[PDB]
Amino acid sequence: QPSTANGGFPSVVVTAVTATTSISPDIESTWKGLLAGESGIHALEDEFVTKWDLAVKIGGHLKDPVDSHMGRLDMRRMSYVQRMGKLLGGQLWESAGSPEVDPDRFAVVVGTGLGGAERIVESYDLMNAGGPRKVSPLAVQMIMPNGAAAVIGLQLGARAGVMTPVSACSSGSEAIAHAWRQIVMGDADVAVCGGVEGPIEALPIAAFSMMRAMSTRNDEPERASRPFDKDRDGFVFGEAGALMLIETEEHAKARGAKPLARLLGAGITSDAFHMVAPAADGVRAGRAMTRSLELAGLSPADIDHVNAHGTATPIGDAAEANAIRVAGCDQAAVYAPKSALGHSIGAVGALESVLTVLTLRDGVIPPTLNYETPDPEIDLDVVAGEPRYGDYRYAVNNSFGFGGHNVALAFGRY
Amino acid sequence: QPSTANGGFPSVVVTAVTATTSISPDIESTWKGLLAGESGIHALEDEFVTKWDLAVKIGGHLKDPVDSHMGRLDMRRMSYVQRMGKLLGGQLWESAGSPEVDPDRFAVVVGTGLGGAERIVESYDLMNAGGPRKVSPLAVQMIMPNGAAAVIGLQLGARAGVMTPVSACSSGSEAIAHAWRQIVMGDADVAVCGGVEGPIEALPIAAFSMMRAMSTRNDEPERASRPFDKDRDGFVFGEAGALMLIETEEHAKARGAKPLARLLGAGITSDAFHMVAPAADGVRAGRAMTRSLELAGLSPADIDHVNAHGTATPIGDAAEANAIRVAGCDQAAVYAPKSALGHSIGAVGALESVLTVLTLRDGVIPPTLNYETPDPEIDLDVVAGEPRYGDYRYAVNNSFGFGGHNVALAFGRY
Numbered sequence: 001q002p003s004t005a006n007g008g009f010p011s012v013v014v015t016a017v018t019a020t021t022s023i024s025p026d027i028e029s030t031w032k033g034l035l036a037g038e039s040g041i042h043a044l045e046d047e048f049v050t051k052w053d054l055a056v057k058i059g060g061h062l063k064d065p066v067d068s069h070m071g072r073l074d075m076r077r078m079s080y081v082q083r084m085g086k087l088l089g090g091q092l093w094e095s096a097g098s099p100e101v102d103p104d105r106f107a108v109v110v111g112t113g114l115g116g117a118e119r120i121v122e123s124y125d126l127m128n129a130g131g132p133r134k135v136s137p138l139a140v141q142m143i144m145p146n147g148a149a150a151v152i153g154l155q156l157g158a159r160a161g162v163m164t165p166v167s168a169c170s171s172g173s174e175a176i177a178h179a180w181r182q183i184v185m186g187d188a189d190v191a192v193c194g195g196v197e198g199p200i201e202a203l204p205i206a207a208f209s210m211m212r213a214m215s216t217r218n219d220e221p222e223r224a225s226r227p228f229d230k231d232r233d234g235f236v237f238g239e240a241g242a243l244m245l246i247e248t249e250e251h252a253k254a255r256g257a258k259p260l261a262r263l264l265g266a267g268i269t270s271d272a273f274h275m276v277a278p279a280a281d282g283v284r285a286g287r288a289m290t291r292s293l294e295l296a297g298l299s300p301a302d303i304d305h306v307n308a309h310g311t312a313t314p315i316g317d318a319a320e321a322n323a324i325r326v327a328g329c330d331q332a333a334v335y336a337p338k339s340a341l342g343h344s345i346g347a348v349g350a351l352e353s354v355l356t357v358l359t360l361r362d363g364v365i366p367p368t369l370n371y372e373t374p375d376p377e378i379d380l381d382v383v384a385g386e387p388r389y390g391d392y393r394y395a396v397n398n399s400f401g402f403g404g405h406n407v408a409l410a411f412g413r414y
Numbered sequence: 415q416p417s418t419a420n421g422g423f424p425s426v427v428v429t430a431v432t433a434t435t436s437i438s439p440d441i442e443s444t445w446k447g448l449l450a451g452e453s454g455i456h457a458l459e460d461e462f463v464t465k466w467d468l469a470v471k472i473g474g475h476l477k478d479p480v481d482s483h484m485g486r487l488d489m490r491r492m493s494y495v496q497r498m499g500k501l502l503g504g505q506l507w508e509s510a511g512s513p514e515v516d517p518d519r520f521a522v523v524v525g526t527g528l529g530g531a532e533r534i535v536e537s538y539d540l541m542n543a544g545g546p547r548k549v550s551p552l553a554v555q556m557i558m559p560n561g562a563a564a565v566i567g568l569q570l571g572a573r574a575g576v577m578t579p580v581s582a583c584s585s586g587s588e589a590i591a592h593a594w595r596q597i598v599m600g601d602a603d604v605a606v607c608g609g610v611e612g613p614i615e616a617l618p619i620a621a622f623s624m625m626r627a628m629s630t631r632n633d634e635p636e637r638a639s640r641p642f643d644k645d646r647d648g649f650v651f652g653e654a655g656a657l658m659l660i661e662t663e664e665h666a667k668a669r670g671a672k673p674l675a676r677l678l679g680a681g682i683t684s685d686a687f688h689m690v691a692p693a694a695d696g697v698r699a700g701r702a703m704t705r706s707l708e709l710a711g712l713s714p715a716d717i718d719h720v721n722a723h724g725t726a727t728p729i730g731d732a733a734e735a736n737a738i739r740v741a742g743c744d745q746a747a748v749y750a751p752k753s754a755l756g757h758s759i760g761a762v763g764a765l766e767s768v769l770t771v772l773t774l775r776d777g778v779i780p781p782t783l784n785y786e787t788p789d790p791e792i793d794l795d796v797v798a799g800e801p802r803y804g805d806y807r808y809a810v811n812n813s814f815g816f817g818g819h820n821v822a823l824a825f826g827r828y
């Protein structure tokens with residue numbers, strides 16, 4: 001049976017990364033802030049918080065708003081996720097040295113949680129006011145959830161496939177998983193992959209906080225996101241978008257690209273348990289970790305680091321603890337970046353994949369914020385207090401999205 | 415290099431199909447109607463046609479509405495695409511003999527064009543009226559575009575992956591393409607795959623008809639959809655949903671399942687040309703056909719039948735004609751089912767995949783409706799007038815969605 005280790009799969013490496021987060025618009029500045037213990041979660045200063053008197057008053061808006069880089073033309077012909085996709089796609093290409101690859105071997109896989117949904121209401125209102133002819137001829141290409149990926153493929157010239165997987169919190173990781181599949185199966189040699197997601201606003205907060213899924217610790221914004229802590233009470237929103245450039249090792253060496261890490265394998269399973277809650281069991285989530293090891297050619301003992309899903313919901317963190325143990329990776333050093341960066345749904349899997357690559361490159365894991373009283377039935381090696389420097393050789397990033405979608409990406413240090 | 419023919423890929427077969435269309439709720443009755451020259455496109459009797467005085471007054475609503483099978487409980491806890499997914503998923507399982515498969519080897523891949531979008535406006539209005547606490551705790555699982563696939567996976571117990579690809583008109587075909595990948599890579603042995611899509615209403619008509627993409631022949635509803643005809647003036651909406659059951663040949667023989675056809679290969683490329691228009695060129699669309707042949711192990715001479723994308727837009731049909739010729743399949747017998755069934759966006763690729771399977775099983779191609787004056791620069795072997803019975807051994811179904819997403823599925827007679 002083929003794997004990355006035995007040569008059945010071509011070696012795929014990560015050569016460029018880009019992200020915009022609640023800490024910084026530059027991924028390297030975000031990484032530095034994460035190591036200094038910074039948090040992007042603050043008190044929400046928007047008027048919709050006091051307009052509706054929401055139970056959740058905290059969150060992390062993007063440090064540098066997307067639309068501050070958007071002129072009038074872009075503001076009326078693209079949805080938000082498309083504008084974020086265009087800005088990130090442009091920054092990623094420049095960071096990669098603006099290489100000139102074969103368009104017929106160039107794929108794009110960008111996940112998202114919803115799509116250009118705000119343009120649905122705009123066309124809804126424009127039609128109620130002026131009739132059917134007041135709807136823009138660009139409404140279709142702005143509304144369609146594949147729009148962000150289509151914009152990036154069109155901007156970069158990717159003709160080996162433009163794909164948009166949708167699986168809530170795992171969209172961004174699943175996009176990287178399919179991009180890896182697209183390369184190891186021979187359909188592409190280079191791929192841009194990641195996830196984009198819209199901003200924080202009233203209705204998203206209302207919908208998620210009625211599931212009792214969000215933290216209500218509005219008095220201390222940066223202490224609210226407490227993954228694996230006893231005092232956790234749900235997740236906190238943190239806006240993000242992230243893309244990475246993956247390609248075969250042959251393709252990277254032929255253009256003089258210094259790879260940051262190795263993309264080894266990817267496992268996609270499902271719970272078939274509940275529409276929003278994860279299986280407390282954790283077998284299928286752990287099976288996704290195991291599956292990524294089989295395709296990578298590794299064993300659970302090789303896994304030094306787990307970038308956990310860690311939303312800080314009571315049920316989710318417990319389910320992941322069982323998942324990590326089921327996969328046999330309970331001895332690894334665990335990091336929950338949502339402690340500092342919050343949850344960005346369709347983008348967070350991509351963002352945490354970048355953080356996983358950065359952890360392998362620099363041999364350091366940022367501290368899990370607010371990890372003060374470890375929950376007794378969650379016995380994990382949670383990095384806390386200060387960054388832990390270590391010989392991290394192989395790492396697994398976890399994404400367990402609403403709907404029961406489990407994605408596990410296996411990364412190795414180059 | 416591995417392929418289906420040389421044994422590098424396990425043989426995958428189609429064992430069950432289900433669809434609801436504008437002609438019939440039963441796929442076999444729809445097939446019979448297609449052979450009798452029936453059309454599902456009528457004059458729209460809804461009030462929103464006269465309320466807005468839309469330019470398009472024609473279309474095909476589902477012959478048997480989804481909600482007529484939906485009680486009060488289902489009507490308030492599921493979006494439309496989820497209700498259609500549940501009904502189709504239940505009918506498909508019963509048609510397959512209700513087999514008892516390994517949940518850990520059972521995958522679901524269901525594409526859609528948008529998602530549970532109507533629930534966004536409902537929560538939008540419910541919050542404006544009663545505040546954030548009048549939003550249902552089920553809003554998230556109803557709105558998320560992965561919701562339809564998640565419902566089907568939960569209902570059928572699929573734990574080897576639940577995936578939702580979004581690529582406009584190619585969503586339904588791409589879902590089958592990823593399900594085939596999920597099996598040939600060893601992640602699953604059996605998979606439910608297809609596409610669902612919402613109904614026809616005012617704003618969808620307004621958005622697509624402002625691109626001048628839709629036919630306005632309201633005087634003769636059934637003559638409006640004219641793929642490859644000189645008098646064509648765009649596509650016509652026709653509601654549909656479709657799922658099929660694919661599995662390895664070993665898995666099918668071990669449960670006594672009579673396979674209907676063979677799923678041989680799948681090619682996914684992209685144009686990177688325009689956000690809605692296809693490349694008049696047609697290279698990348700043809701490359702998706704070629705790619706599906708490489709994975710199948712075939713040559714363009716083996717292709718006896720092409721189930722065309724054939725939307726009946728002026729630019730789209732011309733682009734596909736070049737694509738078919740670029741792929742070397744210009745001698746095959748072409749069918750454009752959108753002549754009779756219309757366009758169902760996220761579902762139509764799945765529906766036409768079922769029609770492709772049925773064409774291979776019964777050795778017959780229904781007539782392309784309204785193909786009376788063939789366009790001079792489109793020289794294709796378009797089946798017309800009456801069903802053409804023929805020795806169809808291998809067929810390719812085409813899907814070229816808005817955004818430049820090209821999916822080609824290669825099918826073979828069992």
Ligand SMILES: CCCCS(=O)(=O)Nc1ccc2n[nH]c(C)c2c1
Pocket residue numbers: 080113114115116117118197198199200201204237238239240343344345
């Ligand atoms: C971290 C914030 C997550 C918010 S979200 O999950 O509800 N996603 C989206 C997607 C599109 C959108 N358009 N306008 C808004 C407010 C959107 C929100």
Ligand SMILES: CCCCS(=O)(=O)Nc1ccc2n[nH]c(C)c2c1
Pocket residue numbers: 494527528529530531532611612613614615618651652653654757758759
């Ligand atoms: C063949 C008809 C295609 C119409 S569509 O392309 O605009 N799709 C959707 C999706 C969800 C929906 N909810 N409510 C409506 C009306 C929806 C329409």
Ligand code: NA
Pocket residue numbers: 307308309310352397398399
């Ligand atoms: Na993670």
Ligand code: NA
Pocket residue numbers: 721722723724766811812813
């Ligand atoms: Na077709």
